[PDB]
Amino acid sequence: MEHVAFGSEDIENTLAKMDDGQLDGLAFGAIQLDGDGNILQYNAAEGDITGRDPKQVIGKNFFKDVAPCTDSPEFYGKFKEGVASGNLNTMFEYTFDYQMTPTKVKVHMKKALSGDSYWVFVKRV
Numbered sequence: 001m002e003h004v005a006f007g008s009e010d011i012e013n014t015l016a017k018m019d020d021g022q023l024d025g026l027a028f029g030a031i032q033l034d035g036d037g038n039i040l041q042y043n044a045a046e047g048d049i050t051g052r053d054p055k056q057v058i059g060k061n062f063f064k065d066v067a068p069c070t071d072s073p074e075f076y077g078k079f080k081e082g083v084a085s086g087n088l089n090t091m092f093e094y095t096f097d098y099q100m101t102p103t104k105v106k107v108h109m110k111k112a113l114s115g116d117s118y119w120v121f122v123k124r125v
């Protein structure tokens with residue numbers, strides 16, 4: 001395992017050192033998005049939660065293509081305000097229900113330490 005707790009205050013500094021292989025050792029799902037919502041990184045734990053194959057969703061748009069259930073003011077709306085503002089740090093519960101059994105999760109969205117990238121972290125509840 002990589003030992004990093006979900007919700008940790010300095011998580012963006014810790015994850016700045018990991019490559020795709022290290023990200024697969026986290027105890028929670030991790031997605032890195034660009035400012036348009038395209039998927040740059042997608043770890044093994046997220047694929048275990050949602051059924052998606054990580055290598056197949058990199059490059060797709062999360063809000064348009066992969067996760068239309070998140071295209072709502074409650075999820076995408078928060079993301080886009082964060083990108084526009086250049087700051088984002090929010091945690092909320094959500095249900096993922098597209099082409100899968102409805103699954104309740106906790107989501108943490110946080111701006112990355114690098115400029116135009118954003119993390120989405122997911123764990124079951």
Ligand SMILES: *C(=O)/C=C/c1ccc(O)cc1
Pocket residue numbers: 046050052066067068069070095096097098
């Ligand atoms: C709603 O459409 C949610 C879909 C979804 C969430 C998270 C993922 O990693 C993949 C699909």
